[PDB]
Amino acid sequence: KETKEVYEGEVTELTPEDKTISHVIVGLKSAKGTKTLRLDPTIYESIQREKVSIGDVIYIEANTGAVKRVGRSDAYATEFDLETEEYVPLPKGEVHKKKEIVQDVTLHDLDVANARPQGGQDV
Amino acid sequence: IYIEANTGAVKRVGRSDAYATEFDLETEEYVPLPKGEVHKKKEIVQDVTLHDLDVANARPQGGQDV
Amino acid sequence: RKIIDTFAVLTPSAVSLDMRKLALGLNDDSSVGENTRLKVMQNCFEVS
Amino acid sequence: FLDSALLNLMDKNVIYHNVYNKRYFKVLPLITTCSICGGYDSISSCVNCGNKICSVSCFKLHNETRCRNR
Amino acid sequence: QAFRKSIGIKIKEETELIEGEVVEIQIDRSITGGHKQGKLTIKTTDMETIYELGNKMIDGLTKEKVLAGDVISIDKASGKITKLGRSVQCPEGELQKRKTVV
Amino acid sequence: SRSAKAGLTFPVGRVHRLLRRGNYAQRIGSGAPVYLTAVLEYLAAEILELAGNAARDNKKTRIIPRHLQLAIRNDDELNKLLGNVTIAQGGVLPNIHQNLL
Amino acid sequence: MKALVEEIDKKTYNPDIYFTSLSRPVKRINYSLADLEARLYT
Protein backbone atom coordinates (compact mmCIF):
# COMPACT_ATOMS: atom_id res chain seq x y z
CA LYS A 1 0.00 0.00 0.00
CA GLU A 2 1.40 3.38 -1.03
CA THR A 3 0.25 6.95 -1.65
CA LYS A 4 1.13 9.03 -4.72
CA GLU A 5 0.65 12.69 -5.62
CA VAL A 6 -1.38 13.77 -8.65
CA TYR A 7 -0.88 17.12 -10.39
CA GLU A 8 -2.94 18.44 -13.31
CA GLY A 9 -3.89 21.76 -14.86
CA GLU A 10 -3.60 24.07 -17.83
CA VAL A 11 -0.06 25.16 -18.71
CA THR A 12 0.33 28.94 -18.40
CA GLU A 13 4.06 29.73 -18.49
CA LEU A 14 7.16 27.72 -19.34
CA THR A 15 10.03 29.92 -18.25
CA PRO A 16 13.34 29.78 -16.37
CA GLU A 17 13.77 31.23 -12.88
CA ASP A 18 15.41 34.56 -12.03
CA LYS A 19 20.76 33.48 -13.49
CA THR A 20 19.90 29.97 -14.56
CA ILE A 21 20.77 26.44 -15.09
CA SER A 22 17.91 25.48 -17.36
CA HIS A 23 14.98 24.39 -15.20
CA VAL A 24 11.40 25.42 -16.00
CA ILE A 25 8.63 26.60 -13.67
CA VAL A 26 5.38 25.08 -14.96
CA GLY A 27 2.31 27.05 -13.94
CA LEU A 28 -0.59 24.61 -13.93
CA LYS A 29 -3.96 26.37 -14.04
CA SER A 30 -6.62 24.06 -12.64
CA ALA A 31 -10.28 24.91 -12.15
CA LYS A 32 -10.36 25.25 -8.36
CA GLY A 33 -6.78 26.52 -8.01
CA THR A 34 -3.72 28.01 -9.67
CA LYS A 35 -0.24 26.90 -8.61
CA THR A 36 3.29 27.07 -10.02
CA LEU A 37 5.76 24.20 -9.66
CA ARG A 38 9.44 23.65 -10.46
CA LEU A 39 10.42 20.47 -12.29
CA ASP A 40 13.49 18.40 -13.12
CA PRO A 41 15.12 18.71 -16.57
CA THR A 42 14.11 15.11 -17.40
CA ILE A 43 10.37 15.63 -16.86
CA TYR A 44 10.80 18.98 -18.64
CA GLU A 45 12.41 17.01 -21.48
CA SER A 46 9.31 14.80 -21.64
CA ILE A 47 7.26 18.02 -21.58
CA GLN A 48 9.23 19.04 -24.68
CA ARG A 49 8.47 15.56 -26.05
CA GLU A 50 4.70 15.97 -25.66
CA LYS A 51 4.80 19.17 -27.83
CA VAL A 52 2.69 21.12 -25.33
CA SER A 53 2.33 24.91 -25.41
CA ILE A 54 0.59 27.75 -23.59
CA GLY A 55 -2.92 26.55 -22.84
CA ASP A 56 -2.66 22.74 -23.00
CA VAL A 57 -4.02 20.39 -20.34
CA ILE A 58 -1.33 17.99 -19.11
CA TYR A 59 -1.13 15.22 -16.51
CA ILE A 60 2.00 15.05 -14.34
CA GLU A 61 2.79 12.49 -11.64
CA ALA A 62 5.11 13.59 -8.84
CA ASN A 63 6.76 10.36 -7.66
CA THR A 64 7.02 8.69 -11.08
CA GLY A 65 7.64 11.64 -13.40
CA ALA A 66 5.49 10.37 -16.28
CA VAL A 67 3.80 13.00 -18.46
CA LYS A 68 0.52 12.55 -20.33
CA ARG A 69 -1.20 15.29 -22.33
CA VAL A 70 -5.00 15.39 -22.37
CA GLY A 71 -5.28 18.03 -25.08
CA ARG A 72 -5.90 21.69 -25.72
CA SER A 73 -8.23 23.35 -23.22
CA ASP A 74 -11.76 24.35 -24.18
CA ALA A 75 -10.95 28.08 -24.00
CA TYR A 76 -8.90 27.88 -27.22
CA ALA A 77 -11.47 25.91 -29.23
CA THR A 78 -12.60 29.07 -31.04
CA GLU A 79 -9.08 30.05 -32.16
CA PHE A 80 -9.15 27.80 -35.24
CA ASP A 81 -12.11 26.24 -37.02
CA LEU A 82 -10.46 22.85 -37.65
CA GLU A 83 -7.67 21.35 -35.55
CA THR A 84 -6.27 17.84 -35.13
CA GLU A 85 -5.82 18.43 -31.39
CA GLU A 86 -9.02 17.51 -29.57
CA TYR A 87 -10.50 19.95 -27.06
CA VAL A 88 -10.86 18.60 -23.53
CA PRO A 89 -12.50 20.47 -20.61
CA LEU A 90 -10.61 21.76 -17.61
CA PRO A 91 -9.98 19.14 -14.88
CA LYS A 92 -12.19 19.59 -11.84
CA GLY A 93 -10.84 19.54 -8.31
CA GLU A 94 -7.63 20.85 -6.82
CA VAL A 95 -4.13 20.90 -8.27
CA HIS A 96 -2.59 18.48 -5.76
CA LYS A 97 -4.43 15.20 -5.19
CA LYS A 98 -3.62 12.10 -3.13
CA LYS A 99 -5.01 8.56 -2.98
CA GLU A 100 -4.03 5.15 -1.63
CA ILE A 101 -3.96 1.88 -3.59
CA VAL A 102 -4.12 -1.72 -2.32
CA GLN A 103 -2.30 -2.91 -5.46
CA ASP A 104 -0.82 -6.41 -5.30
CA VAL A 105 2.43 -7.23 -7.10
CA THR A 106 4.29 -10.55 -7.07
CA LEU A 107 7.78 -10.86 -5.59
CA HIS A 108 9.16 -12.13 -8.90
CA ASP A 109 7.91 -8.90 -10.49
CA LEU A 110 10.01 -7.08 -7.89
CA ASP A 111 12.90 -9.38 -8.84
CA VAL A 112 12.64 -8.44 -12.53
CA ALA A 113 12.31 -4.84 -11.33
CA ASN A 114 15.56 -5.40 -9.42
CA ALA A 115 17.25 -7.23 -12.30
CA ARG A 116 17.08 -5.27 -15.56
CA PRO A 117 15.91 -1.80 -16.66
CA GLN A 118 12.40 -1.93 -18.10
CA GLY A 119 11.64 1.38 -19.81
CA GLY A 120 11.58 5.12 -19.58
CA GLN A 121 10.72 8.26 -21.53
CA ASP A 122 14.30 9.56 -21.76
CA VAL A 123 17.12 8.51 -24.09
CA ILE B 1 46.70 20.13 -9.82
CA TYR B 2 48.88 17.35 -11.24
CA ILE B 3 49.37 17.24 -15.02
CA GLU B 4 51.38 14.69 -17.00
CA ALA B 5 52.81 15.82 -20.33
CA ASN B 6 53.05 12.62 -22.39
CA THR B 7 49.88 10.98 -21.08
CA GLY B 8 47.57 13.95 -20.51
CA ALA B 9 45.99 12.65 -17.31
CA VAL B 10 44.86 15.25 -14.76
CA LYS B 11 44.70 14.73 -10.99
CA ARG B 12 43.75 17.44 -8.50
CA VAL B 13 45.46 17.47 -5.11
CA GLY B 14 43.22 20.11 -3.57
CA ARG B 15 42.98 23.76 -2.67
CA SER B 16 46.29 25.36 -1.71
CA ASP B 17 47.08 26.29 1.88
CA ALA B 18 46.91 30.03 1.14
CA TYR B 19 43.11 29.89 0.79
CA ALA B 20 42.47 27.87 3.97
CA THR B 21 41.42 31.02 5.86
CA GLU B 22 38.83 32.07 3.26
CA PHE B 23 36.09 29.84 4.70
CA ASP B 24 35.85 28.22 8.12
CA LEU B 25 34.49 24.87 6.88
CA GLU B 26 35.06 23.42 3.42
CA THR B 27 34.73 19.95 1.92
CA GLU B 28 37.86 20.53 -0.18
CA GLU B 29 40.93 19.53 1.81
CA TYR B 30 43.87 21.93 2.01
CA VAL B 31 47.16 20.55 0.69
CA PRO B 32 50.53 22.37 0.83
CA LEU B 33 52.35 23.69 -2.20
CA PRO B 34 54.44 21.08 -4.06
CA LYS B 35 58.17 21.47 -3.48
CA GLY B 36 60.69 21.43 -6.30
CA GLU B 37 60.55 22.80 -9.82
CA VAL B 38 57.66 22.93 -12.26
CA HIS B 39 59.15 20.54 -14.82
CA LYS B 40 60.46 17.21 -13.50
CA LYS B 41 61.87 14.13 -15.23
CA LYS B 42 62.60 10.56 -14.12
CA GLU B 43 63.30 7.16 -15.66
CA ILE B 44 61.48 3.90 -14.88
CA VAL B 45 62.64 0.30 -15.38
CA GLN B 46 58.99 -0.84 -15.58
CA ASP B 47 58.41 -4.31 -17.02
CA VAL B 48 55.31 -5.05 -19.10
CA THR B 49 54.43 -8.33 -20.83
CA LEU B 50 54.15 -8.57 -24.61
CA HIS B 51 50.55 -9.80 -24.34
CA ASP B 52 49.76 -6.60 -22.44
CA LEU B 53 51.13 -4.74 -25.47
CA ASP B 54 48.93 -6.98 -27.64
CA VAL B 55 45.78 -6.02 -25.70
CA ALA B 56 47.05 -2.44 -25.89
CA ASN B 57 47.24 -2.93 -29.67
CA ALA B 58 43.89 -4.72 -29.88
CA ARG B 59 41.09 -2.75 -28.20
CA PRO B 60 40.70 0.70 -26.59
CA GLN B 61 41.04 0.50 -22.81
CA GLY B 62 39.66 3.81 -21.52
CA GLY B 63 40.19 7.54 -21.29
CA GLN B 64 38.89 10.67 -19.57
CA ASP B 65 37.06 12.04 -22.63
CA VAL B 66 33.69 11.06 -24.08
CA ARG C 1 -0.18 5.04 -34.38
CA LYS C 2 -3.83 3.97 -34.05
CA ILE C 3 -3.05 0.29 -33.38
CA ILE C 4 -0.34 1.33 -30.91
CA ASP C 5 -2.67 3.84 -29.23
CA THR C 6 -5.51 1.32 -28.97
CA PHE C 7 -3.68 -1.94 -28.19
CA ALA C 8 -0.98 -0.89 -25.67
CA VAL C 9 -2.54 -1.29 -22.22
CA LEU C 10 -0.29 -3.11 -19.75
CA THR C 11 2.25 -1.33 -17.54
CA PRO C 12 5.40 -2.58 -15.77
CA SER C 13 3.84 -2.10 -12.33
CA ALA C 14 7.11 -2.70 -10.42
CA VAL C 15 10.13 -0.44 -10.97
CA SER C 16 13.10 1.01 -9.08
CA LEU C 17 13.64 4.74 -9.50
CA ASP C 18 17.14 6.15 -10.21
CA MET C 19 18.17 2.83 -11.79
CA ARG C 20 18.08 4.35 -15.30
CA LYS C 21 20.84 6.80 -14.34
CA LEU C 22 23.05 4.13 -12.76
CA ALA C 23 22.73 1.59 -15.60
CA LEU C 24 24.63 3.88 -17.99
CA GLY C 25 27.08 5.20 -15.38
CA LEU C 26 25.91 8.83 -15.48
CA ASN C 27 24.91 10.07 -12.01
CA ASP C 28 26.17 12.52 -9.38
CA ASP C 29 29.10 10.23 -8.47
CA SER C 30 30.71 7.56 -10.67
CA SER C 31 34.01 6.58 -12.27
CA VAL C 32 33.22 8.74 -15.32
CA GLY C 33 34.10 12.42 -15.46
CA GLU C 34 32.01 15.54 -15.05
CA ASN C 35 31.05 16.57 -18.58
CA THR C 36 30.68 13.04 -19.95
CA ARG C 37 27.21 12.99 -18.39
CA LEU C 38 26.66 16.60 -19.53
CA LYS C 39 27.69 16.13 -23.17
CA VAL C 40 25.99 12.72 -23.29
CA MET C 41 22.83 14.22 -21.75
CA GLN C 42 22.97 17.07 -24.28
CA ASN C 43 23.52 14.85 -27.34
CA CYS C 44 20.71 12.71 -25.95
CA PHE C 45 18.73 15.94 -25.33
CA GLU C 46 18.98 16.83 -29.05
CA VAL C 47 18.51 13.39 -30.64
CA SER C 48 14.85 12.35 -30.87
CA PHE D 1 63.59 64.06 20.64
CA LEU D 2 60.85 63.39 18.08
CA ASP D 3 59.19 66.72 18.91
CA SER D 4 62.48 68.60 18.41
CA ALA D 5 63.27 70.33 15.12
CA LEU D 6 66.85 69.02 15.09
CA LEU D 7 65.84 66.13 12.81
CA ASN D 8 64.52 66.74 9.30
CA LEU D 9 61.06 65.71 8.14
CA MET D 10 62.68 63.66 5.37
CA ASP D 11 64.96 62.19 8.06
CA LYS D 12 61.91 61.07 10.06
CA ASN D 13 60.23 59.77 6.89
CA VAL D 14 63.32 57.76 5.91
CA ILE D 15 63.94 56.50 9.46
CA TYR D 16 60.34 55.53 10.28
CA HIS D 17 58.04 55.51 7.24
CA ASN D 18 60.41 54.22 4.53
CA VAL D 19 61.95 51.11 6.14
CA TYR D 20 58.65 49.19 6.29
CA ASN D 21 57.71 47.06 3.29
CA LYS D 22 55.23 48.69 0.92
CA ARG D 23 54.27 46.22 -1.81
CA TYR D 24 54.43 42.77 -0.19
CA PHE D 25 51.75 42.38 2.48
CA LYS D 26 51.37 38.58 2.40
CA VAL D 27 53.40 35.91 0.60
CA LEU D 28 53.26 32.90 2.91
CA PRO D 29 49.99 30.96 3.35
CA LEU D 30 47.70 32.18 6.10
CA ILE D 31 46.90 29.86 9.02
CA THR D 32 43.86 30.18 11.28
CA THR D 33 43.99 28.17 14.50
CA CYS D 34 41.95 28.00 17.68
CA SER D 35 42.28 30.84 20.17
CA ILE D 36 42.64 28.47 23.15
CA CYS D 37 44.99 25.63 22.21
CA GLY D 38 45.47 26.22 18.48
CA GLY D 39 43.57 23.22 17.15
CA TYR D 40 43.49 23.28 13.35
CA ASP D 41 41.63 19.96 13.04
CA SER D 42 38.48 21.74 14.27
CA ILE D 43 38.06 25.22 12.76
CA SER D 44 34.88 26.60 14.33
CA SER D 45 34.28 30.33 14.82
CA CYS D 46 32.03 31.32 17.72
CA VAL D 47 28.59 32.94 17.81
CA ASN D 48 28.61 36.25 19.68
CA CYS D 49 32.24 37.05 18.84
CA GLY D 50 33.11 34.74 15.94
CA ASN D 51 36.21 33.39 17.66
CA LYS D 52 37.69 30.11 16.44
CA ILE D 53 37.21 27.34 19.03
CA CYS D 54 38.34 23.76 18.45
CA SER D 55 37.24 21.52 21.32
CA VAL D 56 34.59 21.33 24.03
CA SER D 57 36.83 22.35 26.97
CA CYS D 58 37.98 25.30 24.87
CA PHE D 59 34.36 26.47 24.62
CA LYS D 60 33.61 25.82 28.30
CA LEU D 61 36.72 27.85 29.14
CA HIS D 62 35.76 30.34 26.41
CA ASN D 63 32.33 31.33 27.76
CA GLU D 64 33.68 32.67 31.07
CA THR D 65 36.70 34.87 30.42
CA ARG D 66 37.44 35.39 26.71
CA CYS D 67 33.90 36.21 25.50
CA ARG D 68 33.23 39.95 25.67
CA ASN D 69 30.30 40.28 23.24
CA ARG D 70 28.13 37.79 25.17
CA GLN E 1 34.12 -17.75 -9.28
CA ALA E 2 32.81 -19.67 -6.25
CA PHE E 3 36.39 -20.24 -5.04
CA ARG E 4 36.93 -16.47 -5.26
CA LYS E 5 33.55 -15.82 -3.60
CA SER E 6 34.43 -17.86 -0.50
CA ILE E 7 37.27 -15.68 0.86
CA GLY E 8 36.84 -12.07 2.00
CA ILE E 9 39.03 -9.07 2.84
CA LYS E 10 38.63 -6.63 5.75
CA ILE E 11 39.88 -3.08 5.11
CA LYS E 12 39.50 -0.33 7.73
CA GLU E 13 39.99 3.44 7.73
CA GLU E 14 39.20 6.46 9.91
CA THR E 15 36.85 9.35 9.12
CA GLU E 16 35.80 12.52 10.97
CA LEU E 17 32.22 13.41 11.91
CA ILE E 18 30.69 16.65 13.21
CA GLU E 19 27.27 16.16 14.83
CA GLY E 20 25.44 19.01 16.53
CA GLU E 21 22.21 20.97 16.68
CA VAL E 22 21.61 23.78 14.18
CA VAL E 23 20.66 27.19 15.57
CA GLU E 24 20.04 29.19 12.38
CA ILE E 25 21.07 29.13 8.70
CA GLN E 26 22.19 32.25 6.82
CA ILE E 27 23.29 31.63 3.22
CA ASP E 28 24.32 34.42 0.82
CA ARG E 29 24.05 34.35 -2.98
CA SER E 30 23.42 36.84 -5.80
CA ILE E 31 20.39 37.36 -8.06
CA THR E 32 22.51 37.47 -11.22
CA GLY E 33 26.05 36.29 -10.50
CA GLY E 34 25.94 33.21 -8.29
CA HIS E 35 28.77 32.05 -6.01
CA LYS E 36 26.81 31.12 -2.87
CA GLN E 37 28.26 31.91 0.58
CA GLY E 38 26.76 29.87 3.39
CA LYS E 39 26.88 30.40 7.14
CA LEU E 40 25.14 28.39 9.85
CA THR E 41 25.57 27.75 13.58
CA ILE E 42 26.22 24.29 15.04
CA LYS E 43 25.47 23.72 18.74
CA THR E 44 25.83 20.91 21.26
CA THR E 45 25.84 20.55 25.05
CA ASP E 46 29.33 22.00 25.49
CA MET E 47 30.06 23.70 22.13
CA GLU E 48 28.23 26.31 20.05
CA THR E 49 30.01 27.75 17.01
CA ILE E 50 29.20 29.24 13.59
CA TYR E 51 30.41 27.31 10.53
CA GLU E 52 30.93 29.04 7.19
CA LEU E 53 30.10 26.83 4.21
CA GLY E 54 31.55 26.32 0.75
CA ASN E 55 29.94 25.78 -2.63
CA LYS E 56 29.39 22.03 -2.28
CA MET E 57 28.02 22.46 1.25
CA ILE E 58 25.25 24.67 -0.19
CA ASP E 59 24.89 22.24 -3.10
CA GLY E 60 24.18 19.41 -0.67
CA LEU E 61 22.37 21.84 1.63
CA THR E 62 19.91 22.92 -1.08
CA LYS E 63 19.55 19.59 -2.89
CA GLU E 64 18.48 18.17 0.50
CA LYS E 65 15.94 20.21 2.43
CA VAL E 66 16.98 21.24 5.94
CA LEU E 67 15.78 23.71 8.59
CA ALA E 68 17.12 25.50 11.65
CA GLY E 69 15.24 23.01 13.82
CA ASP E 70 16.65 20.14 11.73
CA VAL E 71 19.98 18.72 12.92
CA ILE E 72 22.79 17.57 10.61
CA SER E 73 25.84 15.33 10.94
CA ILE E 74 28.54 16.11 8.38
CA ASP E 75 31.43 13.94 7.24
CA LYS E 76 34.39 15.92 5.92
CA ALA E 77 35.87 13.28 3.61
CA SER E 78 32.59 12.05 2.12
CA GLY E 79 31.03 15.50 1.73
CA LYS E 80 27.47 14.23 2.09
CA ILE E 81 25.10 15.42 4.82
CA THR E 82 23.15 13.25 7.26
CA LYS E 83 19.98 15.11 8.24
CA LEU E 84 19.26 12.87 11.22
CA GLY E 85 16.78 14.60 13.52
CA ARG E 86 14.81 17.76 14.17
CA SER E 87 14.15 19.94 17.21
CA VAL E 88 14.35 12.47 16.80
CA GLN E 89 17.34 14.45 17.82
CA CYS E 90 18.59 14.67 21.38
CA PRO E 91 22.39 14.69 21.13
CA GLU E 92 25.27 14.38 23.58
CA GLY E 93 29.06 14.19 23.38
CA GLU E 94 31.68 16.33 21.67
CA LEU E 95 31.05 18.15 18.39
CA GLN E 96 33.78 16.75 16.11
CA LYS E 97 34.59 13.07 16.64
CA ARG E 98 36.69 10.61 14.64
CA LYS E 99 35.55 6.98 14.34
CA THR E 100 36.82 4.02 12.32
CA VAL E 101 34.80 2.30 9.58
CA VAL E 102 35.47 -1.28 8.43
CA SER F 1 7.54 34.98 58.78
CA ARG F 2 5.85 32.97 56.03
CA SER F 3 7.96 34.63 53.31
CA ALA F 4 11.10 32.64 54.15
CA LYS F 5 9.36 29.25 54.14
CA ALA F 6 7.78 30.03 50.75
CA GLY F 7 10.86 31.55 49.09
CA LEU F 8 9.66 35.17 49.10
CA THR F 9 11.31 38.50 49.90
CA PHE F 10 8.39 40.91 50.13
CA PRO F 11 6.27 40.45 53.28
CA VAL F 12 2.89 38.74 53.14
CA GLY F 13 1.37 40.57 56.12
CA ARG F 14 1.81 44.06 54.66
CA VAL F 15 0.29 43.06 51.31
CA HIS F 16 -2.52 41.10 53.00
CA ARG F 17 -3.31 43.98 55.36
CA LEU F 18 -3.10 46.42 52.44
CA LEU F 19 -5.60 44.26 50.53
CA ARG F 20 -7.79 44.14 53.64
CA ARG F 21 -7.79 47.92 54.20
CA GLY F 22 -7.75 48.76 50.49
CA ASN F 23 -11.54 48.33 49.99
CA TYR F 24 -11.43 45.62 47.30
CA ALA F 25 -13.76 42.87 48.57
CA GLN F 26 -15.27 41.40 51.73
CA ARG F 27 -13.34 38.10 51.86
CA ILE F 28 -9.62 37.85 51.10
CA GLY F 29 -7.85 34.55 50.47
CA SER F 30 -4.53 33.45 51.91
CA GLY F 31 -2.71 32.61 48.66
CA ALA F 32 -3.44 35.91 46.94
CA PRO F 33 -0.78 38.04 48.76
CA VAL F 34 1.71 35.19 48.24
CA TYR F 35 0.89 35.19 44.52
CA LEU F 36 1.09 38.99 44.45
CA THR F 37 4.49 39.04 46.18
CA ALA F 38 5.62 36.32 43.76
CA VAL F 39 4.60 38.36 40.70
CA LEU F 40 5.95 41.63 42.13
CA GLU F 41 9.17 39.88 43.16
CA TYR F 42 9.66 38.37 39.69
CA LEU F 43 8.89 41.67 37.94
CA ALA F 44 11.06 43.71 40.32
CA ALA F 45 13.83 41.15 39.86
CA GLU F 46 13.41 41.55 36.09
CA ILE F 47 13.78 45.35 36.26
CA LEU F 48 16.68 44.88 38.68
CA GLU F 49 18.56 42.53 36.33
CA LEU F 50 17.81 44.55 33.18
CA ALA F 51 18.75 47.83 34.85
CA GLY F 52 21.71 46.01 36.40
CA ASN F 53 23.03 44.89 33.02
CA ALA F 54 22.19 48.34 31.61
CA ALA F 55 24.37 49.77 34.38
CA ARG F 56 26.99 47.16 33.49
CA ASP F 57 27.05 48.35 29.87
CA ASN F 58 28.16 51.92 30.66
CA LYS F 59 30.84 50.76 33.18
CA LYS F 60 29.19 52.27 36.27
CA THR F 61 28.54 50.62 39.63
CA ARG F 62 25.45 52.77 40.28
CA ILE F 63 22.04 52.76 38.60
CA ILE F 64 21.09 56.13 37.10
CA PRO F 65 17.52 56.59 35.77
CA ARG F 66 18.91 56.62 32.21
CA HIS F 67 19.95 52.98 32.65
CA LEU F 68 16.42 52.10 33.78
CA GLN F 69 14.99 54.16 30.91
CA LEU F 70 17.08 52.33 28.31
CA ALA F 71 16.44 49.01 30.07
CA ILE F 72 12.67 49.52 29.91
CA ARG F 73 12.50 51.09 26.43
CA ASN F 74 14.91 48.56 24.91
CA ASP F 75 12.61 45.68 25.93
CA ASP F 76 9.47 44.99 23.91
CA GLU F 77 7.36 43.60 26.77
CA LEU F 78 8.26 46.52 29.05
CA ASN F 79 7.46 49.07 26.34
CA LYS F 80 4.17 47.31 25.56
CA LEU F 81 3.41 47.02 29.29
CA LEU F 82 4.24 50.67 30.06
CA GLY F 83 3.83 52.93 27.03
CA ASN F 84 2.57 56.09 28.73
CA VAL F 85 4.95 56.06 31.72
CA THR F 86 7.24 59.11 31.88
CA ILE F 87 10.56 58.51 33.67
CA ALA F 88 12.20 61.57 35.21
CA GLN F 89 15.90 62.16 34.37
CA GLY F 90 15.95 59.13 32.07
CA GLY F 91 16.44 60.90 28.76
CA VAL F 92 15.45 59.52 25.37
CA LEU F 93 16.79 56.87 23.01
CA PRO F 94 19.44 57.76 20.39
CA ASN F 95 17.05 57.48 17.44
CA ILE F 96 18.62 58.94 14.28
CA HIS F 97 16.65 58.87 11.04
CA GLN F 98 18.23 57.51 7.86
CA ASN F 99 16.87 60.12 5.43
CA LEU F 100 18.33 63.00 7.49
CA LEU F 101 21.86 61.62 7.01
CA MET G 1 14.70 10.32 -2.05
CA LYS G 2 15.13 13.43 -4.19
CA ALA G 3 11.78 14.89 -5.26
CA LEU G 4 11.65 15.68 -8.98
CA VAL G 5 8.66 18.00 -8.40
CA GLU G 6 8.96 21.16 -6.29
CA GLU G 7 6.16 23.59 -5.44
CA ILE G 8 7.27 27.21 -5.66
CA ASP G 9 5.91 30.77 -5.60
CA LYS G 10 6.64 33.44 -8.20
CA LYS G 11 7.13 36.49 -5.96
CA THR G 12 8.45 34.98 -2.71
CA TYR G 13 10.74 32.29 -4.12
CA ASN G 14 14.00 33.22 -5.77
CA PRO G 15 16.23 30.37 -7.03
CA ASP G 16 19.39 32.08 -5.79
CA ILE G 17 18.63 33.43 -2.30
CA TYR G 18 17.75 30.31 -0.31
CA PHE G 19 16.84 30.78 3.35
CA THR G 20 15.67 28.30 5.98
CA SER G 21 14.88 29.02 9.62
CA LEU G 22 12.66 27.87 12.48
CA SER G 23 14.07 31.34 32.09
CA ARG G 24 12.92 34.04 29.68
CA PRO G 25 14.96 34.19 26.45
CA VAL G 26 15.97 37.70 25.40
CA LYS G 27 18.14 38.89 22.51
CA ARG G 28 21.31 40.70 23.55
CA ILE G 29 20.89 44.47 23.18
CA ASN G 30 23.86 46.74 23.88
CA TYR G 31 22.90 49.65 26.15
CA SER G 32 25.99 51.68 25.20
CA LEU G 33 25.31 55.13 23.78
CA ALA G 34 28.54 55.31 21.76
CA ASP G 35 27.78 51.88 20.28
CA LEU G 36 24.34 52.90 18.98
CA GLU G 37 25.55 56.31 17.81
CA ALA G 38 28.62 54.59 16.33
CA ARG G 39 26.29 52.24 14.44
CA LEU G 40 23.92 54.96 13.19
CA TYR G 41 26.69 57.33 12.00
CA THR G 42 28.66 54.80 9.92
Ligand SMILES: [Zn+2]
Ligand atom coordinates in the same frame (compact mmCIF):
# COMPACT_ATOMS: atom_id res chain seq x y z
ZN1 LIG H 1 41.51 24.94 21.37
Ligand SMILES: [Zn+2]
Ligand atom coordinates in the same frame (compact mmCIF):
# COMPACT_ATOMS: atom_id res chain seq x y z
ZN1 LIG I 1 32.16 33.67 22.14
